[PDB]
């Protein structure tokens, strides 16, 4: 539908992704592309029980602080995260498309250091991805995600606004936290593809990067960012709630 310097939007990327996947590990994540297990069949709850469900910690006061620091160890399987800022990534660590979010899903391909597109399936050593994460009002995308060649997901995005207390009572919301801030909106504090703590911006490979959301249902949403309009479909679960915020 359209192509550009990086944004191969319109849902049509051609071959410029980096097809460097390794099968030495027997986890067989690549073989898990055809089918997805049930929620309670893959041992999700043990991995999903490490983060506080609804009310994590309360106020953090009015000032919207930015202390991105570094979030580098835990996997981004639940909406808790403090993703760091990534500008470039060697193309020897990517296995599949790198979907990035305007928030509307967008694909970024392999490019030369100087920016010349290269057509080598990312096999070449010099291949590198250039993605300087910047907010939509200043251009580029919030942040985005891919799969590392060993079989583990990755995330990256702009600084997340900081909020917390004193009794080990810190909540660093990377998205939403509507009631816990003076009107924190995804257009400001949004970092990754987590629109709200129980929603996702669905894309063709969503079930592959976050296979603990297989039970999620579909929805069609309309969002305004900056001074433009976005039509999007987001996947939110029907976990007991009132979805009219």
């Amino acid at each position: 539908q359209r192509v550009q310097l990086i944004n191969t939007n319109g849902s049509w990327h051609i071959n410029r992704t980096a097809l460097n996947c390794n099968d030495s590990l027997h986890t067989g994540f690549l073989a898990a592309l055809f089918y997805t297990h049930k929620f309670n069949a893959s041992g999700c709850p043990e991995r999903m029980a490490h983060c506080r469900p609804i009310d994590e910690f309360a106020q953090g006061w009015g000032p919207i602080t930015y202390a991105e620091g570094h979030g580098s160890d835990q996997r981004p399987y639940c909406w808790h995260y403090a993703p760091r800022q990534c500008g470039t990534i060697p193309a020897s660590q990517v296995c599949g498309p790198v979907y990035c979010f305007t928030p509307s899903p967008v694909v970024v391909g392999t490019t030369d250091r100087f920016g010349a597109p290269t057509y080598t399936w990312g096999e070449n050593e010099t291949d590198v991805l250039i993605l300087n994460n910047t907010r939509p009002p200043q251009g580029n995308w919030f942040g985005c995600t891919w799969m590392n060649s060993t079989g583990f997901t990755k995330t990256c995005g702009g600084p997340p606004c900081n909020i917390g207390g004193v009794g080990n009572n810190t909540l660093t919301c990377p998205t939403d936290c509507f009631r816990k801030h003076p009107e924190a909106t995804y257009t400001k504090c949004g970092s990754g593809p987590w629109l709200t703590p129980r929603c996702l911006v669905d894309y063709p490979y969503r079930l592959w990067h976050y296979p603990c959301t297989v039970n999620f249902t579909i929805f069609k949403v309309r969002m305004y960012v900056g001074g433009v309009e976005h039509r999007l479909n987001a996947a939110c679960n029907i976990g007991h709630h009132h979805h009219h915020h």
Partner: antibody
Amino acid sequence: AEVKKPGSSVKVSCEASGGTHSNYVITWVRQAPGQGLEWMGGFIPDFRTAMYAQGFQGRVTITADESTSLAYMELTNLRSEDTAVYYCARGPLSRGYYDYWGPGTLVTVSA
Amino acid sequence: SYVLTQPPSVSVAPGQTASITCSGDKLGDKYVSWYQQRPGQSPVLVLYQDSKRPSGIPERFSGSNSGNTATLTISGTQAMDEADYYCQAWDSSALVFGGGTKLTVLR
């Protein structure tokens, strides 16, 4: 139809992506007369990597040509039991249910 | 090896309800899908993911899955619903197709 000589090879072709986003995973299924269905392998247009079933590991080979936007499977060394109807399904990317079963192809061998 | 079993054949009278069961080992944790194959025709999808039904299939078809059995219940059967029915599941990175069940409506 024409009966294939034993020890020969056969090809089954399925429409494949021309080198862009596909959003479907291809598979091949066979049905011997009144014997149910069986699986052979898969193929993901985005990831050239193929997947082969345990039964037919040593005789199947899945490859595709993006220029012609066609993907085919080659089966070699046919025997009497390899007489059946060859289907070609196309299911969603990661839901694992096969929909839009295309027309079948019949191949016969003479013992 | 993983193997699925279903009754060889089921006979039902018009207007009644017929039950077809797909049985395995701890099948309750799999995502089954049912295929209807008429004589000499390509199979078509009739149920995917236990109970979700695609567009174009009448409301008569229904399904359920629990324990070690998956059920395909048909209510108000008529002469048009005579065909082979197959059960599907995924396991150990390999596809398994259950033994075909033949449904015949007595006249």
